[PDB]
Amino acid sequence: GDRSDHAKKLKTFLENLRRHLDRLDKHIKQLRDILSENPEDERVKDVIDLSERSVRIVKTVIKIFEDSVRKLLKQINKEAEELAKSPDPEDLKRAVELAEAVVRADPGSNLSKKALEIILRAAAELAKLPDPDALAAAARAASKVQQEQGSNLAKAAQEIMRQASRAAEEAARRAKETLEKAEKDGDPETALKAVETVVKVARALNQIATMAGSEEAQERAARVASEAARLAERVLELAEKQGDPEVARRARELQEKVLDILLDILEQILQTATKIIDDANKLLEKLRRSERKDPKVVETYVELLKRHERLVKQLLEIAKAHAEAVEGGSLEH
Amino acid sequence: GDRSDHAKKLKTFLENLRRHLDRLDKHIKQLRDILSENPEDERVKDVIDLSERSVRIVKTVIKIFEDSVRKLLKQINKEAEELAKSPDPEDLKRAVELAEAVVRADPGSNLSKKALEIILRAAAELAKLPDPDALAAAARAASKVQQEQPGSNLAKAAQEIMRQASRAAEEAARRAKETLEKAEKDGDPETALKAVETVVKVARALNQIATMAGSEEAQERAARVASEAARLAERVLELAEKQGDPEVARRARELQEKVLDILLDILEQILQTATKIIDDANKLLEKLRRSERKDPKVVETYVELLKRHERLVKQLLEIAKAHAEAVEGG
Amino acid sequence: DRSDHAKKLKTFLENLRRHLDRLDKHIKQLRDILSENPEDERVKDVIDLSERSVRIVKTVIKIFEDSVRKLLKQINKEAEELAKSPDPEDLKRAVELAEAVVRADPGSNLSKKALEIILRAAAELAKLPDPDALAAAARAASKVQQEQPGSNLAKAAQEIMRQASRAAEEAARRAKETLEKAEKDGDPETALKAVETVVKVARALNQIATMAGSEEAQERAARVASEAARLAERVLELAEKPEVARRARELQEKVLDILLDILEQILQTATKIIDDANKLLEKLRRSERKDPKVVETYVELLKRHERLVKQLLEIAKAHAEAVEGGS
């Protein structure tokens, strides 16, 4: 946007001044280098002084700006901390965006630190809300805390993620019940909305899993997603039963969403397996060239082979589930 | 949209699996090498055991997955067949995308053949619909079939459908003229605005249908059609200013531009064709200068290229002339 | 829509001559073959047919280039009359149409007359207080100065560019006047728009300044920018005393970005000079016999550079105030 270009312009602008500063200095040196040719000549020395003043001047400009920028980040910090307390989702999320941006402007600083801590509160609060996308966002923001940081904040961040997973799971549980409760009542509109929500929890679960990369987390997300198709399959039935032609498309479209979700999870797992083996080869590559085998390393190699057997085994399992989802089309009609 | 986004991903995903096989299968081969050095290294036998099993897993994953998708496409190709029967153009248009979407995934197979047959039915349906843009989209879908397999029965049908689309468009264009005269008698420029507007869309629509077919003759019929539409604009302009809708009459003089656009687009294609032809002619001659003996079979086609190339230029000018006749009225 | 056409037009004329060449190359093929063996009659015919079509294609260019000129002439006349029209949207159309004529055929006389037409329109566009439009008058007019610099025309642009500036400053002043009224009345939407109007003036003025390039122009733009935030601080407090408070903060964020824009513009100028100054220098150190007049040129650039850097400071301080004020 306009402000997002200007933030880069802020990051760019600062770099530009150093760029100009060099140009002064590189030019200065040339005048400095002309000095040695005719040292006695004062005029050149006078010139150096003029251009030097410019350099010194410019330095202050950096000082002011970096102060001003840092000051603006402080002001930006405050808005977030306040936006963290307000329970409204957009307000809390707005606290995140403002927070994250302060970091991007200048990571690895104590100003960023307070912004890092500020995020944490928001994600916990967002973790309370049951909107899947919101819960996904907290995972996004929470994961950013760890990925940027193994740190205590990350250790706390993991809890928010953990809370998020459980929060997403409970959100999955209740919507399942309501979606379940509706079938005997026969209101398909509530079902299509109830159905879509679990899927949202599946995405979240998948999205959250990737960010921390837990195959188990992928599995739970995997567990969630598969049920959805069965739930979507049954929703298509109530639509076919009650003469509800529009909803059928909502059921039909939901089927594809999970497939890509499942596919998204499948491809998510396979990328890890790729990495895992490559670790083994580099690890293995040392053994053959190794003077003497090292058990701690050799055992480490084993786990890699064994976990690939894990990760590969997961792919096989989920593959059937993905094949199951396809089955729902033929049987019902 | 995001369903079409995934189809690239799913096809891509397969390659990473096949990629993983060679990674694993290669990695095993190295372990095989280590075992070759010391054929009695029990652990080396143990490690290899895991991998050939893991390979068996993935090997199963593929056959499962690619079979799963084959059955999947079956759903999509089947469901679209029902959509074609329905009269809702949007549903058909939607139906087209699925059959269209299918072919991209698995070109050249039997199921794609079933998609092609489906695509035509919906395309044939759109030739009946009177919306000029819709008549174009049908052609657009129809031509894709001719591209997939020329010289087939479907290639025959497609050209047969594309022809009907060109036919249908003129009827709507004729209709506006009929309704145009009514607008003249009933003194309502606003109607003629859309009436002429519909005509303009036809010529534009007809060009696009002309382009895919890439037949110079059809282009001139589209050109001839467009040339009159420019005259209609003048007929719209005169009646409009007098009878009380200048601001709407502002669109007509603006519409006069669109005709010039269509005329430019027609000529651009006509030349682009002509350039290609003359290139081949040069190529054919090049073969003939080098050749030990002139093979009349090549010469005959070479000359025919020149003859055909000539016709286009004549076609180009008479069009180029009409383009001015369009401007001159302005 | 139209954007594609003018470009699409340019190719076709280019491709036409381009096509004409391929024909002559084919003729070159038959001319050589013919020279190798005069006896082949079949070459002559194919030459003739190849020769026949070339004339037609050559003719078509004449038809088209002529016809294209007529439309450029027609648009010029319609552009002029639309120029007369007071309605502002009509004014743009004239420009938009008038520019098309120029970019379609730079340097031509017909193009010269349109550029002349163009110039009249911006003057009419200058009068209207809407800041967004004022820049447009400055925008299109500046294009003319670059197309025909230093001519009798360029002075009109420069003078026309100046006229907007004198007019523009008052439209921002009207906002200051409107807000004090808006403040007493208490309409939060009414007060915010005045700031956004003042903010618009800023971005417009710097663009006008940046487009002419004079460091002075950006300087006059400097003083206004600072006090917009002092206004923007009031509106949020007026709205507090939801929709209006959230945007009031945004306005401050738009000002600082505007300060930044002014900053980058000062710099780019400044930095370009030092290359020129350094490049200027190298020639001096190199040339055995120095040319004192050229030395002076160098000096004024280093002096100017110092002058331009000072401004950055003077600006950067004002900018600094804006952030503090927003605290």
Residue numbers in the entry:
A (entry chain B): 0 to 148, 150 to 333
B (entry chain C): 0 to 329
C (entry chain A): 1 to 241, 245 to 330
Lines from the paper:
We develop a hierarchical approach to designing multi-component protein assemblies from two classes of modular building blocks: designed helical repeat proteins (DHRs) and helical bundle oligomers (HBs). We first rigidly fuse DHRs to HBs to generate a large library of oligomeric building blocks. We then generate assemblies with cyclic, dihedral, and point group symmetries from these building blocks using architecture guided rigid helical fusion with new software named WORMS. X-ray crystallography and cryo-electron microscopy characterization show that the hierarchical design approach can accurately generate a wide range of assemblies, including a 43 nm diameter icosahedral nanocage.
First, we explored the generation of C3, C4, and C5 assemblies with WORMS using heterodimer fusions. This resulted in head-to-tail cyclic ring structures dubbed “crowns” (Crn). We solved the structure of the C3_Crn-05 to 3.19 A resolution. The overall topology is as designed and the backbone geometry at each of the three junctions is close to the design model. A deviation at the tip of the undesigned heterodimeric HB is likely to due to crystal packing. Each of these structures experimentally verifies three distinct helical fusions (two HF, one WORMS) from the building block library that had not been characterized in isolation, confirming that the building blocks in the in silico library can have sufficient accuracy for subsequent building efforts.
